[PDB]
């Protein structure tokens with residue numbers, strides 16, 4: 454229960470990269486006026502949620518790995534808060550995919566259908582679903598009725614306290630039957646379905662060229678969605694597949710602790726790549742990113758630049 458320092462520090466690294474990249478995304482929309490359109494509300498939402506994952510969710514996740522002494526229901530609330538915030542991250546990422554779906558399939562009415570007000574509707578829905586799902590264990594679907602005294606004793610916890618571990622407060626059936634399907638499998642299948650429809654649009658345009666600018670938009674879009682989906686599956690499936698193994702094999706010895714830490718960390722790394730890489734693949738975002746990091750360097754190197762120039766003067 455002591456914990457692994459290697460895990461803690463790698464987990465801390467991800468939090469920083471998640472905050473850096475997504476502040477970068479949001480900063481870029483505030484400065485650049487070209488980036489201030491409806492389509493980017495979905496990108497800003499996702500970036501905002503990823504920040505909260507770095508600031509709030511990952512620090513909370515670190516705590517839950519240590520098995521510190523606390524009231525079971527306090528421990529459950531922290532685990533639930535990790536679930537809500539990561540869920541919002543997933544759902545707001547889905548919103549980007551549904552947006553691109555409408556944009557490519559119904560390009561005419563898109564501008565009349567996907568308005569700034571309706572975009573905030575969708576954003577709110579993302580957060581309603583996140584709370585409803587991640588807080589579900591609060592309503593009674595939890596392991597707090599059956600505390601572990603033997604483990605609580607070994608950690609030297611006072612009476613009425615337990616070792617705060619994730620798998621000790623959050624039930625595996627909740628994780629497997631509700632959380633995995635609602636939060637991971639459905640969104641993944643929906644996003645994969647969106648990618649397959651954009652790909653097929655590109656294939657139809659390409660087949661027409663076998664007889665003598667929309668094709669470039671669709672090929673770029675399909676690539677962007679392949680990245681999102683590929684990364685999302687690589688980041689989220691290992692941890693949840695592990696959870697299924699744990700649930701369906703109660704007699705099996707538990708999956709190694711190093712694999713657990715790797716999978717948890719892997720799931721958190723979705724908040725640094727999604728949707729940074731997506732935004733980074735729009736030139737307008739990419740150029741604005743340069744102006745910001747540029748101005749950060751021509752203002753941090755100044756003490757050493759002035760020193761070197763003065764050192765050469767009297768050389």
Ligand SMILES: CCNC(=O)[C@H]1O[C@@H](n2cnc3c(N)ncnc32)[C@H](O)[C@@H]1O
Pocket residue numbers: 514535536537539540619620628632636692696717720721
């Ligand atoms: C909405 C999906 N959220 C999660 O799965 C997060 O919950 C936590 N989590 C999920 N399964 C486990 C587990 N078996 N052990 C510890 N934490 C977990 C991780 O921080 C995940 O990123």
Ligand SMILES: CCCCCCCCS[C@@H]1O[C@H](CO)[C@@H](O)[C@H](O)[C@H]1O
Pocket residue numbers: 494498501502569
């Ligand atoms: C997790 C936190 C959720 C953050 C969501 C931020 C949504 C900002 S929308 C944006 O706000 C501007 C003024 O602020 C208005 O000028 C625009 O018309 C309007 O579209």
Ligand SMILES: CCCCCCCCS[C@@H]1O[C@H](CO)[C@@H](O)[C@H](O)[C@H]1O
Pocket residue numbers: 570573574577
């Ligand atoms: C929970 C259901 C919420 C309904 C969906 C719309 C959310 C609007 S929030 C609020 O609305 C103002 C105008 O309505 C915007 O200008 C602000 O930027 C925004 O912060």
Ligand SMILES: CCCCCCCCS[C@@H]1O[C@H](CO)[C@@H](O)[C@H](O)[C@H]1O
Pocket residue numbers: 509573576577578580581
């Ligand atoms: C530690 C506490 C951190 C929790 C942060 C939650 C941020 C909520 S943003 C808020 O969500 C609403 C629906 O809940 C939407 O209707 C609005 O558009 C949006 O402004």
Ligand SMILES: CCCCCCCCS[C@@H]1O[C@H](CO)[C@@H](O)[C@H](O)[C@H]1O
Pocket residue numbers: 592593594595596598624
């Ligand atoms: C709206 C109020 C609804 C109340 C929700 C109760 C549903 C609990 S199901 C049952 O709860 C046990 C708690 O003792 C756990 O041990 C088990 O894992 C789980 O199968």
Ligand SMILES: CCCCCCCCS[C@@H]1O[C@H](CO)[C@@H](O)[C@H](O)[C@H]1O
Pocket residue numbers: 589592594626630
């Ligand atoms: C808000 C509460 C919503 C639903 C709570 C009850 C969910 C239990 S499902 C079902 O329970 C059985 C034993 O009870 C087992 O087959 C597994 O543990 C699980 O598959």
